Amino acid sequence: GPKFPRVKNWELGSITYDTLCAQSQQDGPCTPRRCLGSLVLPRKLQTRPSPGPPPAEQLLSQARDFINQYYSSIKRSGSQAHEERLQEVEAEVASTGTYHLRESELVFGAKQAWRNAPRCVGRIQWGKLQVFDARDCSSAQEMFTYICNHIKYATNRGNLRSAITVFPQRAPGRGDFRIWNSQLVRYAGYRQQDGSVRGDPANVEITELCIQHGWTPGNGRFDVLPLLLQAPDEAPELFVLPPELVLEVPLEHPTLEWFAALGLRWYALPAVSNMLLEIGGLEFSAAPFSGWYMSTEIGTRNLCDPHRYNILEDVAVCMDLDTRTTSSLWKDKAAVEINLAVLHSFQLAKVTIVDHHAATVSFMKHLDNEQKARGGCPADWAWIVPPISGSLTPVFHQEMVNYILSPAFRYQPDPW
Amino acid sequence: KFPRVKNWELGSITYDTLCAQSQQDGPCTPRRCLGSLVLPRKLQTRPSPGPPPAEQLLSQARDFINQYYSSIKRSGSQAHEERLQEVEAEVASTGTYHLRESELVFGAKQAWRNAPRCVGRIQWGKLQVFDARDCSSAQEMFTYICNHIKYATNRGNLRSAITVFPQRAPGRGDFRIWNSQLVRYAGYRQQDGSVRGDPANVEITELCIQHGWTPGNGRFDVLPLLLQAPDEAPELFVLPPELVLEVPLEHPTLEWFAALGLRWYALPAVSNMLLEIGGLEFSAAPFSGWYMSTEIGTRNLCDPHRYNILEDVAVCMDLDTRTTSSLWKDKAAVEINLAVLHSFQLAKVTIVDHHAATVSFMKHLDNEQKARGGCPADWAWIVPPISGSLTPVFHQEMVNYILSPAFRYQPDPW
Ligand code: HEM
Ligand code: HEM
Numbered sequence A: 001g002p003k004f005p006r007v008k009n010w011e012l013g014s015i016t017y018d019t020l021c022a023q024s025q026q027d028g029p030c031t032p033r034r035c036l037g038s039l040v041l042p043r044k045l046q047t048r049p050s051p052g053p054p055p056a057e058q059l060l061s062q063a064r065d066f067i068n069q070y071y072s073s074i075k076r077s078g079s080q081a082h083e084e085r086l087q088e089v090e091a092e093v094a095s096t097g098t099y100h101l102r103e104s105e106l107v108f109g110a111k112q113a114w115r116n117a118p119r120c121v122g123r124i125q126w127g128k129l130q131v132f133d134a135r136d137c138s139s140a141q142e143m144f145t146y147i148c149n150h151i152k153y154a155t156n157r158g159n160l161r162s163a164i165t166v167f168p169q170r171a172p173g174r175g176d177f178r179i180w181n182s183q184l185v186r187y188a189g190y191r192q193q194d195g196s197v198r199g200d201p202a203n204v205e206i207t208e209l210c211i212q213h214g215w216t217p218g219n220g221r222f223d224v225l226p227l228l229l230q231a232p233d234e235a236p237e238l239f240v241l242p243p244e245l246v247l248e249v250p251l252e253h254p255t256l257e258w259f260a261a262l263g264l265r266w267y268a269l270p271a272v273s274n275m276l277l278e279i280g281g282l283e284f285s286a287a288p289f290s291g292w293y294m295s296t297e298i299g300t301r302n303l304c305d306p307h308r309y310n311i312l313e314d315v316a317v318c319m320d321l322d323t324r325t326t327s328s329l330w331k332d333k334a335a336v337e338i339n340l341a342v343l344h345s346f347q348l349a350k351v352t353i354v355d356h357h358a359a360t361v362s363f364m365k366h367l368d369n370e371q372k373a374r375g376g377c378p379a380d381w382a383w384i385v386p387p388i389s390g391s392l393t394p395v396f397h398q399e400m401v402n403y404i405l406s407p408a409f410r411y412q413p414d415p416w
Numbered sequence B: 001k002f003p004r005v006k007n008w009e010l011g012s013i014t015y016d017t018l019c020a021q022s023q024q025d026g027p028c029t030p031r032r033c034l035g036s037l038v039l040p041r042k043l044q045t046r047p048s049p050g051p052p053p054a055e056q057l058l059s060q061a062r063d064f065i066n067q068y069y070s071s072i073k074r075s076g077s078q079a080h081e082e083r084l085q086e087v088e089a090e091v092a093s094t095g096t097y098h099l100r101e102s103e104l105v106f107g108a109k110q111a112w113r114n115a116p117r118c119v120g121r122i123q124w125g126k127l128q129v130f131d132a133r134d135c136s137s138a139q140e141m142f143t144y145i146c147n148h149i150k151y152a153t154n155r156g157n158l159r160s161a162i163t164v165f166p167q168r169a170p171g172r173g174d175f176r177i178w179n180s181q182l183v184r185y186a187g188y189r190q191q192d193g194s195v196r197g198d199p200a201n202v203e204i205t206e207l208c209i210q211h212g213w214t215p216g217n218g219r220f221d222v223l224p225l226l227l228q229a230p231d232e233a234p235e236l237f238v239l240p241p242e243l244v245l246e247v248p249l250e251h252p253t254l255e256w257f258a259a260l261g262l263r264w265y266a267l268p269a270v271s272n273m274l275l276e277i278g279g280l281e282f283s284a285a286p287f288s289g290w291y292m293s294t295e296i297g298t299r300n301l302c303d304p305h306r307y308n309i310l311e312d313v314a315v316c317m318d319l320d321t322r323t324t325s326s327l328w329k330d331k332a333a334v335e336i337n338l339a340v341l342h343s344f345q346l347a348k349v350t351i352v353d354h355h356a357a358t359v360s361f362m363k364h365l366d367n368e369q370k371a372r373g374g375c376p377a378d379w380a381w382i383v384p385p386i387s388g389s390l391t392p393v394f395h396q397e398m399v400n401y402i403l404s405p406a407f408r409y410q411p412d413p414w
């Protein structure tokens, strides 16, 4: 039949064809010989620091592509404003090597990038992103102000709002604007004497970086890291977030009274800050974005991963389960309760959060929407299906096609 | 070239060089990954009314023959050369060839070893291989199948096994087991479109009735087999109740669980897949091992399109099924998987939980890394349907590709 991937939902037995992938202009990591879909960091999108100005020819075509995308979204493709804008871009690139985006173009692209992210199960909210334009920012100090405003507006006292702050794009020769931290809010990872780690093992390197840069470390298991903001061609400066801006939620269980005694907690705002936002060729090296958590992110990955807090065994001992044999499913039991606790503690503190059931159901709706609007929706199965109760969610039974569309968020090399 | 594979829990890394030996193509392309698809769009297995290109078959054959002799440490040996000539000669004169028992045995085990979606491959070396090529009738197939089931079951102490019927032949119909598994529960469509029993077996359950089977009306009615001899309407055979071992499900502490009347068979034996060795195709080659608890407790019993018992258990556990956030669903799934493990252990029937299983698979990955330089794996299928990140495989990147000998999906014979 149709010459496009045939996708099936085994729960409903329904079929669809992804024609949207035909618009992908960027190759992924797979080949007919072998599939590399499970790789986290496939050396593909990897936006390596490219000092020498981008091939005006390559950039121009990427630019003409985005502009077409923009005028199309406003239903003026082929119009006078469209062709003139197209001329304006080529002109500007002709005499400067690069070009700039209009305000409304940035807003559109930022949303498309989110809309195009294959690993985000929260894309049903893609149309409501609040885009803060910070392309005027000229200092690491100013960056801190923008970030603080971002956190304030986004946190909104527990009633979270999606947002993204876009700092200056990359300029030929000049240094990039960068946020060294992986997230605006992260807990410290202190390497111990015996070799173990106190806090979040994931953040050991950045913790040692803040220290090498003048940060007086604490010694807790949940210390909020300071920010390492870097303006063009300068060494990063250190900024400490005002405690009042960083909303946190103590974790307690709805019925296991002892859970609260564990002293576990998590912050409310998930703000990825080390990803590159690419729009029409232009590269925004610093554009932290944030939404709200899906409970398994905290309860299953962050708190139970072997290489993170790894609290599975402690909670199992507390529930008095048989941690000496796998068939007792002690891991599965403790994981459930830990997840439930996160859901309970966030609801109680009136802080926005969504469970994996509600979340995936909403993504199914998002898929049905995009099927009609764009002919498909790029999705990374391994990242869409929740870390616990996979086949209990409807996404598990939905086949998915993964591919890269632009605008887009890409991983980028650490500045150091 | 060779993919760098990382394990995010240990920070360890490896390079898959085995994928280079892949001669067959998957559905992926650089433009888009289609790895999450269950069935191939084109990678099917087209009819065999005409003989395959001698050069194509001959090369697949030589390669396999090379694999065999290398396995027994006698490459370039005299026997190796003479065997290659035997194959050449047979192909050139008849358009095909035949395998010798030992080669068949080596092939079957390799097919399992190369199965990307199988998590139990650490056991790949211990496979009992029944040569059933000396078969010429559906009734003979039935006897063969009954012996496989007897041996495989072994009073609850399961043993991996496979039975290989006659290979496919040009212009001649295929020997086929119409059933997807040797043991399956009927699926009866009722008035309001709903289904009594296993919804996944509605179609096969119907074909059986159509061929004269007196259907039952239960939720776990073991279906009969529809065996087909070349170019002959399939025949109906009823499995001797004593041969089909079953496990009644109860819960270690929830006394009421058993009152649900849930049960499941002990033998997981896929029978609709095709076994390809050195270009030869075996359309009927049922194989079996032993279940991993989540296959029953999570997928078969809790899938929406299966027995979908999640809510019933939830109500009995008196859970708040008003909102998703109460995780009533996750809580019930865990007890259902627990009952499966409890029951099977209580009935002294082989079974492996998903934690033990994945740990064993990691070991296998290592054994294979050193033994062949890689191991083709399909992440979505290796990672359990529940508690994924709670198992080690979740955190292990994987490369997936097609190696031969291999098990492949083939068209439904009707
Ligand atoms: C509104 C609520 C949102 C929810 C529930 C949601 C949820 C998720 C989850 C569960 C992940 C994967 C978690 C993991 O395995 O690490 C994720 C990844 C991602 N999300 Fe969203 N998201 C939301 C908002 C945002 C926003 C506002 C943006 C962009 C402007 C966004 C962009 C992305 C990207 C790029 C990734 C993948 C990042 C990576 O590869 O590590 N998300 N999201
Ligand atoms: C010894 C115990 C075994 C265990 C515990 C085991 C476990 C598994 C599991 C969990 C799956 C995924 C099932 C699904 O989600 O549908 C699977 C798939 C598979 N296994 Fe095994 N396996 C075992 C033995 C065998 C044997 C003996 C063979 C072959 C000789 C085999 C061949 C395969 C194949 C071909 C698949 C993929 C089936 C498909 O594509 O639908 N397995 N196995």
Ligand SMILES: NC(=[NH2+])NCCC[C@H](N)C(=O)O
Pocket (backbone or CB within 6 Å): A183, A270, A272, A290, A291, A292, A293, A294, A297, A298, A301, A302
């Ligand atoms: N809900 C989100 N926007 N999540 C983005 C990724 C957050 C990451 N998984 C974390 O646990 O911090």
Ligand SMILES: NC(=[NH2+])NCCC[C@H](N)C(=O)O
Pocket (backbone or CB within 6 Å): B181, B268, B269, B270, B288, B289, B290, B291, B292, B295, B296, B299, B300
């Ligand atoms: N352990 C196995 N060999 N399983 C093969 C597939 C069985 C199938 N998943 C079932 O639930 O019946």
Ligand SMILES: [Zn+2]
Pocket (backbone or CB within 6 Å): A030, A034, A035, A036, A037, B028, B029, B032, B033, B034, B035
């Ligand atoms: Zn792929």
